[PDB]
Amino acid sequence: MVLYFIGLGLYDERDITVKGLEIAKKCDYVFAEFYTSLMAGTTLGRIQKLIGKEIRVLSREDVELNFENIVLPLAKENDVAFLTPGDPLVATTHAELRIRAKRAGVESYVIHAPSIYSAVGITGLMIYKFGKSATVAYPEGNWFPTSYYDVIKENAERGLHTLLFLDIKAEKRMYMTANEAMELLLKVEDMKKGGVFTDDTLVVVLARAGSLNPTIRAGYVKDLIREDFGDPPHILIVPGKLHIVEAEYLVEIAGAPREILRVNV
Amino acid sequence: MVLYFIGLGLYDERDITVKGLEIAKKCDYVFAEFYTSLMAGTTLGRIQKLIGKEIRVLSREDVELNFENIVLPLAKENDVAFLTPGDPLVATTHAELRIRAKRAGVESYVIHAPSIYSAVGITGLMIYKFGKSATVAYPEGNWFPTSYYDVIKENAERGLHTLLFLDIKAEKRMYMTANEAMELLLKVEDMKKGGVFTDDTLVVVLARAGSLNPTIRAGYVKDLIREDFGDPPHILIVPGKLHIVEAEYLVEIAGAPREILRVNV
Numbered sequence: 001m002v003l004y005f006i007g008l009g010l011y012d013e014r015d016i017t018v019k020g021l022e023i024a025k026k027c028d029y030v031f032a033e034f035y036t037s038l039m040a041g042t043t044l045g046r047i048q049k050l051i052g053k054e055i056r057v058l059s060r061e062d063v064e065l066n067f068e069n070i071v072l073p074l075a076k077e078n079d080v081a082f083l084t085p086g087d088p089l090v091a092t093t094h095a096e097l098r099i100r101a102k103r104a105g106v107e108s109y110v111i112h113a114p115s116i117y118s119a120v121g122i123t124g125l126m127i128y129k130f131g132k133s134a135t136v137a138y139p140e141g142n143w144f145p146t147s148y149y150d151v152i153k154e155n156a157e158r159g160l161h162t163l164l165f166l167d168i169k170a171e172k173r174m175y176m177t178a179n180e181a182m183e184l185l186l187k188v189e190d191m192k193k194g195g196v197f198t199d200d201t202l203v204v205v206l207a208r209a210g211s212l213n214p215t216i217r218a219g220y221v222k223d224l225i226r227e228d229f230g231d232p233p234h235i236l237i238v239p240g241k242l243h244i245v246e247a248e249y250l251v252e253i254a255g256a257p258r259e260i261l262r263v264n265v
Numbered sequence: 266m267v268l269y270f271i272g273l274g275l276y277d278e279r280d281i282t283v284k285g286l287e288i289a290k291k292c293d294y295v296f297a298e299f300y301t302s303l304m305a306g307t308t309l310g311r312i313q314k315l316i317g318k319e320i321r322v323l324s325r326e327d328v329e330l331n332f333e334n335i336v337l338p339l340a341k342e343n344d345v346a347f348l349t350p351g352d353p354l355v356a357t358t359h360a361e362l363r364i365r366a367k368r369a370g371v372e373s374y375v376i377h378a379p380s381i382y383s384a385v386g387i388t389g390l391m392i393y394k395f396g397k398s399a400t401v402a403y404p405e406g407n408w409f410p411t412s413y414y415d416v417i418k419e420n421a422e423r424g425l426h427t428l429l430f431l432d433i434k435a436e437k438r439m440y441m442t443a444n445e446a447m448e449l450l451l452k453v454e455d456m457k458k459g460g461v462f463t464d465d466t467l468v469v470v471l472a473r474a475g476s477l478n479p480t481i482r483a484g485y486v487k488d489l490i491r492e493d494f495g496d497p498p499h500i501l502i503v504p505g506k507l508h509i510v511e512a513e514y515l516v517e518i519a520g521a522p523r524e525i526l527r528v529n530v
């Protein structure tokens with residue numbers, strides 16, 4: 001009679017919360033999806049071992065189309081777990097899945113886990129200063145999306161920080177690097193000429209959040225555009241005017257150049 | 266020989282990540298603070314039991330004024346952990362404590378935990394649509410804080426949602442409720458008369474996120490301002506222009522007025 005939406009966390013199989021692990025262990029069936037995002041620091045096998053249950057993986061179609069035929073039927077007479085990377089209902093559309101559960105007469109509960117939305121606090125950037133978020137998507141064919149450029153403009157205009165999710169082809173396990181995102185943004189700048197993103201723009205890169213050894217770097221596009229930030233996933237941030245405290249953290253912790261203490265404050 | 270910033274989670278001792286627990290179990294000394302947020306579903310004892318270590322609780326003054334005198338000295342010869350509610354670097358100034366660690370020659374690591382900042386995803390409001398965040402602070406003496414009113418205005422104009430952290434006076438066991446936040450906002454409205462927060466404003470309340478049965482409610486201020494949302498902690502959200510899919514969830518899951526289903530395009 002119960003369906004548990006359980007967050008897997010940021011990076012590896014230890015990023016799930018104790019609550020989520022123990023509940024997953026007591027469930028009769030455990031499902032998981034890896035199409036909204038991936039757990040770059042672990043594997044299905046490792047996660048299976050930790051939980052001590054076989055995990056049935058579901059595709060985007062299995063969920064978006066046949067969630068009530070695959071998952072809900074079992075949740076009617078058993079305790080079922082549905083695992084997803086990060087924090088459940090975060091940057092996803094699983095929210096409506098709770099409505100599907102309701103109409104099928106199934107109870108559902110959410111077991112939270114860290115999300116990059118909050119994890120980016122490790123960059124030293126104050127959380128309240130973040131504005132609207134966006135995703136940088138790969139252009140393809142005759143399609144060149146640029147709305148993320150406008151989000152940065154509107155945020156920075158109000159002194160707010162912009163969290164930019166980088167394109168990911170989950171099924172193919174292909175990551176867009178921060179380097180690629182920067183190249184894309186410069187190209188967009190060249191087309192819109194808004195003065196939003198240039199070689200002089202200060203950016204922050206967070207790689208492998210959740211890992212004990214994440215890469216946290218800050219500097220101007222001209223110097224970071226070709227830097228190696230390590231293995232994905234990469235997250236790009238375009239800070240607005242930093243607070244003194246923010247800049248100091250970037251310099252002391254993210255190796256930012258002293259120059260930001262006077263140019264970006 | 267290192268210092269661990271470990272988040273404890275939203276509600277109870279089990280909201281810590283498995284990563285955080287295993288690491289905390291092997292530390293020589295464990296410190297903590299419980300003034301930045303309220304974990305309404307656990308106690309110091311339970312946390313101590315789970316981690317299997319005695320925990321020395323610090324006050325805001327101990328941290329802000331003497332962190333390098335109390336904690337850092339031990340971290341020079343031992344493995345030390347500093348525990349906090351939710352995520353240690355979200356809506357706190359703890360980030361700066363990493364700079365102090367550096368100067369003391371102490372390497373520090375951060376272990377994330379579920380945060381209210383991402384847990385709001387359970388309201389059904391899309392996380393990317395949130396703008397600048399703010400805190401509703403208790404007025405003290407002749408001093409009546411009001412900036413949070415302008416944050417709402419700026420966000421709403423942009424059709425963005427506004428997350429409002431509520432005040433907390435831990436040493437006095439005072440936890441601002443959504444009801445008090447609302448009362449204060451109506452007062453600010455009467456003064457600034459910007460038409461930002463009135464009896465007809467649609468709001469969302471999330472209480473005790475992290476527990477299995479949090480209170481999730483959406484509705485007009487006139488109807489919710491005197492509603493009982495249960496024990497603290499609470500957060501208040503003033504949504505921007507709602508997406509049809511956000512409205513549906515608010516209605517089906519948060520008991521919102523069915524009329525919000527009719528969005529004015």
Ligand SMILES: Nc1ncnc2c1ncn2[C@@H]1O[C@H](CSCC[C@H](N)C(=O)O)[C@@H](O)[C@H]1O
Pocket residue numbers: 275276301302303350351352353354355356357379380381382429430431432433471472473474475498499500
């Ligand atoms: N479990 C919870 N449920 C509802 N609100 C919460 C909450 N935990 C924190 N809050 C909100 O956040 C405020 C504290 S600010 C500190 C947040 C913490 N660092 C975190 O990452 O979660 C509380 O006063 C309340 O307004």
Ligand code: NA
Pocket residue numbers: 130131132133392393395396
């Ligand atoms: Na945000």
